[PDB]
Design a protein around this motif. Structure first.
Motif, PDB file in Angstrom:
ATOM      1  N   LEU A 116       0.873  -1.389   0.017  1.00  0.00           N
ATOM      2  CA  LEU A 116       0.052   0.075  -0.027  1.00  0.00           C
ATOM      3  C   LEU A 116       0.696   1.242  -0.118  1.00  0.00           C
ATOM      4  CD1 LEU A 116      -2.098  -2.276   1.476  1.00  0.00           C
ATOM      5  CD2 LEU A 116      -3.452  -0.185   1.971  1.00  0.00           C
ATOM      6  N   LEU A 117       2.080   1.431   0.471  1.00  0.00           N
ATOM      7  CA  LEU A 117       2.799   2.367   0.552  1.00  0.00           C
ATOM      8  C   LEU A 117       3.594   2.880  -0.655  1.00  0.00           C
ATOM      9  CD1 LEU A 117       5.363   3.196   3.382  1.00  0.00           C
ATOM     10  CD2 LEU A 117       6.247   3.864   1.369  1.00  0.00           C
ATOM     11  N   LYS A 118       3.296   2.133  -1.804  1.00  0.00           N
ATOM     12  CA  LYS A 118       3.665   2.639  -3.198  1.00  0.00           C
ATOM     13  C   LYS A 118       2.661   3.566  -3.561  1.00  0.00           C
ATOM     14  CE  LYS A 118       5.333   0.952  -7.660  1.00  0.00           C
ATOM     15  NZ  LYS A 118       4.385   1.770  -8.275  1.00  0.00           N
ATOM     16  N   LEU A 119       1.348   3.246  -3.120  1.00  0.00           N
ATOM     17  CA  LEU A 119       0.485   4.206  -3.364  1.00  0.00           C
ATOM     18  C   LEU A 119      -0.272   4.895  -2.124  1.00  0.00           C
ATOM     19  CD1 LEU A 119      -2.479   2.035  -3.655  1.00  0.00           C
ATOM     20  CD2 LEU A 119      -1.438   1.708  -5.837  1.00  0.00           C
ATOM     21  N   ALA A 120       0.288   5.710  -1.835  1.00  0.00           N
ATOM     22  CA  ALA A 120      -0.241   6.543  -0.604  1.00  0.00           C
ATOM     23  C   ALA A 120      -0.046   7.967  -0.989  1.00  0.00           C
ATOM     24  CB  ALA A 120       0.166   6.054   0.959  1.00  0.00           C
ATOM     25  N   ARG A 121      -0.744   8.607  -1.575  1.00  0.00           N
ATOM     26  CA  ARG A 121      -0.551  10.116  -2.161  1.00  0.00           C
ATOM     27  C   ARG A 121      -0.489  11.087  -1.081  1.00  0.00           C
ATOM     28  NH1 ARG A 121      -4.603   9.943  -5.381  1.00  0.00           N
ATOM     29  NH2 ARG A 121      -5.809  11.010  -3.850  1.00  0.00           N
ATOM     30  N   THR A 122       0.695  11.417  -0.610  1.00  0.00           N
ATOM     31  CA  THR A 122       1.087  12.545   0.259  1.00  0.00           C
ATOM     32  C   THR A 122       0.750  13.849  -0.454  1.00  0.00           C
ATOM     33  OG1 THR A 122       3.080  12.327   0.152  1.00  0.00           O
ATOM     34  CG2 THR A 122       2.084  10.976   1.839  1.00  0.00           C
ATOM     35  N   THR A 123       0.797  14.729   0.141  1.00  0.00           N
ATOM     36  CA  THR A 123       0.405  16.174  -0.447  1.00  0.00           C
ATOM     37  C   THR A 123      -0.541  16.141  -1.135  1.00  0.00           C
ATOM     38  OG1 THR A 123       1.954  16.036  -2.316  1.00  0.00           O
ATOM     39  CG2 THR A 123       3.179  16.781  -0.382  1.00  0.00           C
ATOM     40  N   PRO A 124      -1.883  16.234  -0.610  1.00  0.00           N
ATOM     41  CA  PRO A 124      -3.021  15.705  -1.441  1.00  0.00           C
ATOM     42  C   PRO A 124      -3.561  16.859  -2.217  1.00  0.00           C
ATOM     43  CG  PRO A 124      -3.520  16.521   0.663  1.00  0.00           C
ATOM     44  CD  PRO A 124      -2.255  16.499   0.554  1.00  0.00           C
ATOM     45  N   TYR A 125      -4.163  16.468  -3.078  1.00  0.00           N
ATOM     46  CA  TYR A 125      -4.862  17.376  -4.326  1.00  0.00           C
ATOM     47  C   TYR A 125      -6.168  17.942  -3.518  1.00  0.00           C
ATOM     48  CZ  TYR A 125      -7.728  13.728  -6.450  1.00  0.00           C
ATOM     49  OH  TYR A 125      -8.602  12.882  -6.723  1.00  0.00           O
ATOM     50  N   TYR A 126      -6.312  19.232  -3.743  1.00  0.00           N
ATOM     51  CA  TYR A 126      -7.413  19.834  -2.963  1.00  0.00           C
ATOM     52  C   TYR A 126      -8.691  20.149  -3.899  1.00  0.00           C
ATOM     53  CZ  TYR A 126      -4.747  20.929   1.128  1.00  0.00           C
ATOM     54  OH  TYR A 126      -3.934  20.892   2.225  1.00  0.00           O
ATOM     55  N   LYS A 127      -8.685  19.361  -4.975  1.00  0.00           N
ATOM     56  CA  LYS A 127      -9.737  19.323  -5.772  1.00  0.00           C
ATOM     57  C   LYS A 127     -10.951  18.525  -5.408  1.00  0.00           C
ATOM     58  CE  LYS A 127      -8.963  18.455 -10.464  1.00  0.00           C
ATOM     59  NZ  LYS A 127      -8.822  17.770 -11.600  1.00  0.00           N
ATOM     60  N   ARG A 128     -10.949  17.811  -4.379  1.00  0.00           N
ATOM     61  CA  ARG A 128     -11.924  17.295  -3.324  1.00  0.00           C
ATOM     62  C   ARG A 128     -12.584  18.594  -2.888  1.00  0.00           C
ATOM     63  NH1 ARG A 128     -10.134  12.235  -1.645  1.00  0.00           N
ATOM     64  NH2 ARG A 128      -9.611  11.237  -3.749  1.00  0.00           N
ATOM     65  N   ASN A 129     -12.007  19.657  -2.665  1.00  0.00           N
ATOM     66  CA  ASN A 129     -12.901  20.549  -1.720  1.00  0.00           C
ATOM     67  C   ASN A 129     -13.528  21.491  -2.612  1.00  0.00           C
ATOM     68  OD1 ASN A 129     -11.924  19.182   0.445  1.00  0.00           O
ATOM     69  ND2 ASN A 129     -10.114  20.713   0.408  1.00  0.00           N
ATOM     70  N   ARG A 130     -13.242  21.868  -3.833  1.00  0.00           N
ATOM     71  CA  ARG A 130     -13.918  22.730  -4.968  1.00  0.00           C
ATOM     72  C   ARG A 130     -15.324  22.454  -4.996  1.00  0.00           C
ATOM     73  NH1 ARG A 130     -12.794  22.090  -9.851  1.00  0.00           N
ATOM     74  NH2 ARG A 130     -11.914  19.821  -9.896  1.00  0.00           N
ATOM     75  N   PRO A 131     -15.964  23.442  -5.008  1.00  0.00           N
ATOM     76  CA  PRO A 131     -17.542  23.320  -5.246  1.00  0.00           C
ATOM     77  C   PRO A 131     -17.776  22.727  -6.274  1.00  0.00           C
ATOM     78  CG  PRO A 131     -16.647  25.639  -4.378  1.00  0.00           C
ATOM     79  CD  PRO A 131     -15.768  24.859  -5.094  1.00  0.00           C
ATOM     80  N   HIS A 132     -19.066  22.029  -6.199  1.00  0.00           N
ATOM     81  CA  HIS A 132     -19.308  21.215  -7.420  1.00  0.00           C
ATOM     82  C   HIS A 132     -20.195  21.984  -8.392  1.00  0.00           C
ATOM     83  CE1 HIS A 132     -22.943  21.180  -4.640  1.00  0.00           C
ATOM     84  NE2 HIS A 132     -23.626  21.410  -5.627  1.00  0.00           N
ATOM     85  N   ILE A 133     -20.090  21.535  -9.664  1.00  0.00           N
ATOM     86  CA  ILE A 133     -20.611  22.109 -10.773  1.00  0.00           C
ATOM     87  C   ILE A 133     -21.651  22.652 -10.773  1.00  0.00           C
ATOM     88  CG2 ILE A 133     -20.899  20.110 -12.250  1.00  0.00           C
ATOM     89  CD1 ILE A 133     -19.412  23.604 -13.443  1.00  0.00           C
TER      90      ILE A 133
END
Ligand SMILES: O=P(O)(O)O[C@H]1[C@@H](OP(=O)(O)O)[C@@H](OP(=O)(O)O)[C@@H](OP(=O)(O)O)[C@@H](OP(=O)(O)O)[C@H]1OP(=O)(O)O
Ligand SMILES: Nc1nc2c(ncn2[C@@H]2O[C@H](COP(=O)(O)OP(=O)(O)OP(=O)(O)O)[C@@H](O)[C@H]2O)c(=O)[nH]1
Ligand SMILES: [Mg+2]
Ligand SMILES: [Zn+2]
Ligand SMILES: [Zn+2]
Ligand SMILES: [Zn+2]
Ligand SMILES: [Zn+2]
Ligand SMILES: [Zn+2]
Ligand SMILES: [Zn+2]
Lengths: 97, 112, 130, 56, 243, 188, 167, 56, 138, 41, 97
Positions: free
Chosen positions: F133-150
């Motif tokens: 799992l440690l090969k895919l544990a994306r640190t420094t996450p992308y904040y496009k999760r938090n952007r308001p939906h369309i």
RNA sequence: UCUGGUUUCUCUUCAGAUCGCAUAAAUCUUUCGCCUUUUACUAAAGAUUUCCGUGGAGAGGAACAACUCU
RNA sequence: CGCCGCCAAGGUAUGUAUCAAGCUUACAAG
């Protein structure tokens, strides 16, 4: 007495809470070290203190959630051992009596 | 009562006639609301209007005044139908609390 | 209470059997959450400083045992040399001039603070998606 | 320190809501049933304050 | 269990502790006891209230109901008639103003309660009579002066309710004098029906009758009123002016 | 049925501010799995971002060591079945409404009242980790999760709000690739 | 006064700018009703005048005697000419409490239900020894006598109140 | 009807137990401190038509 | 129109009456028009806007210009053509270009704060064209 | 933590559960109050 | 309505005693019991009215007659003009004013 | 010469008073009365509450507060 | 010397299988 007093005070301030209490003063901040990820997650998020307030409830709302659910009663306390005297069996004649 | 005042402030009935109007309303509920049917203890107050009506309606008609409509002295019936609501506020507030609870979270079958 | 008792380190090879997160201290399943009594105003001030300009001072108690830096994006802090939002700044640059009608005399012409500003192929793809 | 507002606000809200048969106001209609609990206390405070016949 | 109008606290008066009972010792002999008698509703048990408010600086004076707490019993605070006296021991200062004593009894004035007034007449000698100025002398008044001079007690008289004469009947001043002269002449000619004491008449000039209004607590009489002529702006030398 | 004091919340959902102000209800919404009335919390992550309230209860987060609103792993920042296949054990939970559902949630809450510190069964196999799992544990996450939906009305070109439309614009989503265990589309 | 299927009239476009007709407003003349004249038909009559009223909470009031004598003149036709509680002999509250307690009635007064003193009993030798057609009746004992003072005219009274006597 | 009003006058004056109520709360001073209620000053008949509209 | 003071009002009311009649007619138009398209709360901004401009017309007509006397000013307030409250917040120091009284009430807001209409735009971030959700804009 | 219906889960303010007899008489001194029981024969 | 305590009472005054009045019904005088001057007792007072109305009186329960006799005697003590009697046919009687 | 404050809004406990110069509704326990059973009821007693209101108290302002009680 | 004034349930069954508005969130999301 003080334990069941605060129990019954919270009870009647929940069973009959209908009369005009203040909301709270939720100015109390809460600091929490986000002890999971922090290396460059919010670069410098060492301890990330937050402000937690409590949202007002309007006193013109019905009950919101359907309190009507019934599941069967769960697993009880797992059984203590039983420890009688040595159980006897009587006869085949007094058992016939 | 609100339709009486809005009939006055539409301007197509006047003040003496409004006063006689809502005196008739406060004196003759029961005949025009059927509220006694659902809570019969208030029939007393219906009678208490109809009783004190006589008090007023036979001192208007003292002297050369006449036995017809016009007794617009409506304070003494207004008072008792407010003293009804003085004690029917908590009761049917509680009845409607239970009604809105049972509508919005369902009845509890074998609880209490 | 004595400093030597609590400051005394732990003997051992640190138990690297666990993961980083489970070995880390907590009380809540996500980090040690504890109350605080910060001043309301300086909280709000440095909060708004970060929320506007992307830098603030860092809050801590025992990170390095000494912590006095800025965080967020660093270089814009010293571009403004550590000014705040409640300060009449060193320059008045990139302002944006509104047109004002504050007479309350003309009708459909009075815009007080409600003044709308002086500034005032994809549909094929949108019709094919829908 | 909260005080009166213009009287053309209540009129605008209730003229908008109307009979609650449009779909825009459906988030509020639940709150309307919630204010049935306090309707007799609104009618009491109404009828305490009838204008006397010497008023307009 | 039920009580009959108990009081306590031995209320503060002016002097009546043992710093003045030591001089009440010989003044236990110059006491000049009275049993004021009157007719039924002639203000005497309110008159004793007026003087006991004059004594005590602690009052719950009448704003709504009168302070007839000398009518103590519960069978007389609901009737309002007086069934039982409670005699009072006070002091009263005079125009000179050191002290006297005045242990004082206030009988019921109802005619069927002609009993208890007799039980004060064989005790004391002061039979100061109460008459309404607005109503006149009546049954228990004439029977009671008759019973007093039959015991040859000192028949002085304090006619009362002259506010009721003039705030209520609204008489002009000369006619108010005519009424008071008439009432003093009537009690004089009534006392002189049994003339073993022919010289003894009563008038204001002898200092024998004092007017009053117990509703508003006024003492009247001219030997005391020319004092209030004297202490402000007079230098009159009363009791020759007063007579 | 459930009170709380502070939520679970993986780091990408808090936002880039160390100073965030957050509001709470007492019985807020229901859990979107088990219909349990938790205490919904709301905050602003960032100045260009929606509010992202709170999605499941504290109980249904303590079951699978999952954050509170975006439904990802609290240790990694990964979906659920990535963790459970990557730890080769599923920690079963029923699907229906009662059939063992609120029964097992009620009872696993009753045997979770003591600790409140760690997940209920994952604690033994969350140690033997960090290889696959440690090969895919994306640190420094992308904040496009938090952007308001369309927003709509830019999709239909109607949006009278102009600039002050808070949501978004000119992001037409594509209808070819967008619950709690399986199956989830981007995970394949 | 309004038919069904007619929604209740919408106070914006219906009677907002409609002026009201006229109130009742008995006309007061000057030179007799001179104090009350400026304020007598006003919603709270003296509200913003610190001389006569408390303030804007409208809790306390102090008047002057011309200003109250005119009100006392205006407030006849519904105010009693009885100067004392002497008209109310055996119409007092305590006379009514006694009449309630004693199961009897003043004529023109209220008639209650009996209370717990319902049924009496005396055996025949005893009430025969006390009360035959032996006593000197002269005029009957009316019930106003029993309500007047309920002790010598009435055996076994209780829960009883005792009336006032000649103001 | 005279004597049947004196009956009610006596029953009220007899059963007058003194007011042993303990606390005073207000429920409008409780409502107005919320973000949801707003105060205004309206005409009477507006408020009457208002609450009959709301009751319907 | 209802006047509710039977006063035969003082002078010069005749020179403000056509102005105030125009503002009342525009307030009836801004009160009556439908709410379709207008989202939920932008359909109640214009009553605050025209209330603001009506109170501001009487405001700058009296304090600033000193044309109208005191008696007619108190008349226009006591009738209803102005706020007694909002001129009292216009007279205070830092704020007299104010929107209305909802952006001062610190417990209409959930966080115990004053609304972002009442923030100096020079010291907010540069481009966000926020309009107050209560009152309408800044 | 989420009790039965009497606590928080219900708004059913039933009658017979209305604050009646809300203060307790203690046995005062003329009766058999337990201070007068701690020594009696 | 109140009562102030007195150590001793000189002559000229009046006073209430506390508890001589068991063997008395009306007015009388008291002296010292030393066989002294034999004050030939003060005469009983003359009412100047004749108690002429005369009710017969009976207890309801014939059992407890001495308790109402105790009450009747205490009445006769506290009301001086009252004259109570009992006659040959057994009925008690009170004649008063 | 010095001392120097009524309104109005919110909280803070105490209420012992015709807290209210009048007077609602409920619950319980008994007796009534109609009654077929149950809620709607009847009309008396006892003891409890809820509700519409009030009284004195601490604090915070703001409203002419500087007119002036003192 | 002048009681009295009336609603509801208790009867026109309920129990299944397909077919929309009423109400419900407008969310988590490579
Ligand atoms: O109630 P209504 O029948 O509508 O009439 C009532 C009233 O009735 P009650 O007395 O039965 O309550 C009396 O009329 P009657 O009793 O004679 O029918 C009353 O007293 P007067 O009749 O002596 O006036 C008066 O009737 P009137 O129309 O004569 O005024 C009054 O009428 P309102 O209905 O207008 O009040
Ligand atoms: N106008 C007027 N009335 C008075 C005066 N004094 C007493 N009264 C009224 O007279 C009424 C009855 O008198 P009481 O106060 O009972 O005094 P009283 O004459 O001793 O009555 P009894 O104790 O029965 O003998 C009271 O209600 C007073 O209001 C007075 O000086 N002037
Ligand atoms: Mg059955
Ligand atoms: Zn859940
Ligand atoms: Zn998350
Ligand atoms: Zn848009
Ligand atoms: Zn603004
Ligand atoms: Zn505004
Ligand atoms: Zn704003």
């Amino acid at each position: 007495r003080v334990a069941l007093e605060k129990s019954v005070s919270q009870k009647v301030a929940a069973a009959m809470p209908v009369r005009a209490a203040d909301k709270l003063a939720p100015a109390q901040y809460i600091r929490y070290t986000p002890s999971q990820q922090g290396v460059a997650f919010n670069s410098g998020a060492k301890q990330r203190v937050i402000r937690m307030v409590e949202m007002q409830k309007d006193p013109m709302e019905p009950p919101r959630f359907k309190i009507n659910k019934k599941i069967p009663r769960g697993p009880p306390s797992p059984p203590a051992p039983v420890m009688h005297s040595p159980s006897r069996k009587m006869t085949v004649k007094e058992q016939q009596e | 009562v609100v339709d009486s005042h809005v009939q006055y402030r539409l301007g197509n009935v006047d003040a003496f006639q409004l006063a006689d109007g809502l005196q008739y309303i406060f004196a003759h509920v029961g005949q025009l609301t059927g509220m006694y049917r659902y809570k019969y203890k208030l029939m007393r107050q219906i009678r208490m209007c109809k009783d004190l009506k006589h008090l007023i309606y036979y001192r208007f008609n003292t002297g050369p005044v006449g036995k017809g409509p016009g007794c617009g002295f409506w304070a003494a019936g207004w008072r008792v139908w407010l003293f009804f609501m003085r004690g029917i506020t908590p009761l049917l507030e509680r009845w409607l609390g239970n009604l809105l609870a049972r509508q919005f979270e369902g009845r509890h079958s074998k609880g209490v | 209470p004595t400093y030597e008792t609590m400051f005394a380190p732990e003997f051992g090879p640190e138990n690297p059997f666990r993961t980083q997160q489970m070995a880390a201290p907590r009380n809540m399943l996500s980090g040690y959450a504890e109350p605080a009594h910060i001043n309301d105003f300086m909280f709000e001030q440095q909060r708004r400083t970060f929320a506007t300009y992307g830098y603030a001072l860092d809050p801590s108690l025992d990170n390095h045992q000494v912590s006095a830096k800025y965080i967020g994006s660093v270089e814009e802090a010293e571009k403004n040399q550590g000014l705040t939002v409640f300060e009449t700044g060193q320059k008045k640059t990139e302002k944006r001039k509104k047109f004002k009608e504050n007479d309350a005399s003309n009708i459909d012409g009075f815009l007080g603070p409600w003044a709308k500003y002086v500034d005032e192929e994809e549909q094929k793809e949108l019709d094919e998606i829908t | 320190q909260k005080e009166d507002m213009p009287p053309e606000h209540v009129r605008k809200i209730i003229r908008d809501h109307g009979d609650m048969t449009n779909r825009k106001f459906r988030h509020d209609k639940r709150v309307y049933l919630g204010a049935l609990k306090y309707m007799p206390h609104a009618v009491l405070k109404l009828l305490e304050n009838m204008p006397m016949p010497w008023e307009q | 269990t039920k009580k009959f109008t108990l009081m306590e606290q031995t209320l503060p008066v002016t002097v009546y502790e043992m710093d003045f009972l030591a001089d009440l010792m010989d003044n236990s002999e110059l006491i000049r006891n009275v049993t004021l008698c009157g007719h039924l509703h002639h203000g005497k048990t309110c008159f004793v209230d007026c003087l006991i408010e004059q004594t005590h600086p602690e009052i719950r004076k009448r704003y709504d109901q009168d302070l007839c707490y000398t009518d103590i019993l519960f069978t007389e605070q609901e009737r309002g008639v007086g069934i039982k006296s409670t005699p009072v021991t006070v002091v009263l200062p005079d125009t000179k103003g050191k002290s006297y004593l005045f242990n004082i009894m206030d009988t019921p004035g109802h005619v069927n309660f002609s009993d208890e007034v007799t039980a004060g007449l064989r005790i004391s000698d002061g039979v100061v009579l109460f008459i309404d100025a607005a109503e006149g002398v009546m049954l228990n008044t004439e029977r009671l002066i008759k019973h007093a001079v039959q015991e040859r007690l000192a028949v002085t008289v304090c006619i009362n309710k002259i506010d009721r004469l003039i705030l209520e009947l609204k008489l002009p001043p000369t006619d108010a004098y005519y009424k008071l002269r008439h009432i003093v002449d009537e009690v004089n000619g009534l006392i002189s029906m049994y003339s073993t004491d022919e010289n003894l008449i009563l008038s204001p000039l002898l200092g024998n009758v004092c007017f009053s209004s117990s509703q508003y607590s006024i003492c009247f009489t001219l030997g005391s009123f020319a004092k209030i002529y004297a202490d402000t702006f007079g230098d009159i030398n009363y009791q020759e002016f007063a007579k | 049925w459930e009170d709380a004091d502070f939520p679970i919340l993986c780091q990408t959902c808090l936002g880039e501010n160390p100073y965030i102000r957050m509001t709470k209800e007492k019985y807020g919404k229901e859990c979107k799995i088990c219909a349990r009335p938790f205490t919904v919390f709301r905050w602003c992550p960032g100045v260009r971002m929606r509010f992202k309230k709170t999605e499941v209860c504290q109980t249904c987060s303590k079951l699978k060591n999952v954050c509170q609103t975006c439904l990802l792993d609290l240790e990694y920042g990964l979906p659920i079945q990535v963790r459970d296949a990557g730890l080769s054990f599923k920690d079963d939970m029923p699907k229906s409404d009662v059939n063992k559902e609120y029964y097992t949630q009620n009872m696993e809450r009753e045997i979770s009242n003591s600790d409140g510190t760690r997940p209920v069964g994952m604690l033994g196999k969350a140690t033997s980790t960090s290889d696959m799992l440690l090969k895919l544990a994306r640190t420094t996450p992308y904040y496009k999760r938090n952007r308001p939906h369309i927003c709509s009305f830019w999709v239909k070109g109607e949006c009278k709000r102009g600039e002050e439309c808070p949501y978004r614009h000119e992001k037409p989503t594509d209808p070819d690739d967008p619950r709690y265990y399986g199956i989830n589309d981007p995970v394949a | 006064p309004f038919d069904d299927e007619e929604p209740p009239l919408d106070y914006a476009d219906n009677i907002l700018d409609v002026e009201p007709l006229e109130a009742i407003q008995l006309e007061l003349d000057p030179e007799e009703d001179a104090p009350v004249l400026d304020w007598f038909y006003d919603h709270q009559p003296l509200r913003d005048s610190r001389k006569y009223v408390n303030g804007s909470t409208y809790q306390r009031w102090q008047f002057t005697l011309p200003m109250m004598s005119t009100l006392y003149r205006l407030a006849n036709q519904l105010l009693t000419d009885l100067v004392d509680d002497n008209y109310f002999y055996l119409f007092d509250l305590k006379a009514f409490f006694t009449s309630k307690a004693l199961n009897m009635a003043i004529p023109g007064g209220p008639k209650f239900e009996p209370l717990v003193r319902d049924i009496n009993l005396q055996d025949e030798d005893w009430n025969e020894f006390n009360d035959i057609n032996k006593i000197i009746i002269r005029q009957p004992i009316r019930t106003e006598y029993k309500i007047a003072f309920p002790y010598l005219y009435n055996n076994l009274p209780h829960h009883v109140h005792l009336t006032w006597y000649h103001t | 009807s005279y004597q049947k009003l004196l009956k009610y006058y006596v029953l009220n004056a007899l059963k007058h137990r003194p007011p042993k109520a303990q606390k005073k709360r207000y429920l409008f001073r409780s409502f107005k401190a919320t973000k949801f209620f707003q105060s205004t000053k309206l005409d009477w008949v507006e408020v009457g038509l208002q609450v009959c509209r709301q009751g319907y | 129109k209802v006047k509710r003071s039977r006063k035969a009002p003082p002078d010069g009311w005749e020179l403000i009456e056509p102005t105030l009649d125009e503002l009342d007619q525009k307030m009836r138009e801004a009160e009556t028009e439908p709410h379709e398209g207008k989202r939920k709360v932008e359909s109640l901004w214009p009553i605050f806007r025209i209330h603001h401009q009506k109170t501001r017309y009487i405001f700058d007509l009296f304090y600033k210009r000193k044309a109208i006397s005191r008696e007619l000013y108190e008349y226009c307030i006591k009738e209803g053509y102005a706020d007694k409250n909002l001129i009292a917040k216009w007279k205070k120091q830092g704020y007299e270009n104010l929107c209305c009284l909802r952006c001062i009430q610190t417990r209409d807001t959930n966080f115990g704060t004053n609304c972002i209409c009442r923030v100096p735009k020079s010291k907010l971030e540069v481009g966000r064209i926020i309009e107050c959700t209560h009152c309408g804009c800044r | 933590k989420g009790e039965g219906d009497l606590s928080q889960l219900s708004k059913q303010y039933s009658s017979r559960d209305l604050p009646s007899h809300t203060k307790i008489k203690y046995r005062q001194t003329t009766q058999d109050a337990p201070e007068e029981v701690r020594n009696r024969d | 309505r109140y009562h102030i305590e007195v150590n001793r009472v000189p002559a000229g005054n009046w006073v209430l005693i506390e508890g001589v009045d068991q063997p008395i019904v009306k007015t009388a005088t008291i002296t010292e019991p030393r066989g002294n001057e034999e004050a030939q007792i003060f005469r009983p007072l003359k009412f100047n009215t004749t108690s002429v109305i005369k009710i017969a009186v009976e207890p309801v329960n014939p059992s407890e007659l001495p308790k109402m006799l105790d009450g009747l005697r205490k009445v006769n003590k506290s009301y001086p003009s009252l004259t109570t009697k009992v006659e040959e046919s057994g009925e008690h009687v009170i004649l008063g004013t």
